[PDB]
Design a protein around this ligand. Sequence first.
Ligand SMILES: [Zn+2]
Length: 48
Amino acid sequence: GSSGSSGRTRKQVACEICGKIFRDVYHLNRHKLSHSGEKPYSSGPSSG
Ligand SMILES: [Zn+2]
């Protein structure tokens, strides 16, 4: 149930880690610093 004609075009950056909005990745690059660079999901081993 949806037309699929108009809507909010995605032309910006949005940090989901903390929940913020930015202009372009060029700005998010400096913001990522505050966050972690590597987030390995070690707490979740595979299974059958
Ligand atoms: Zn962030």
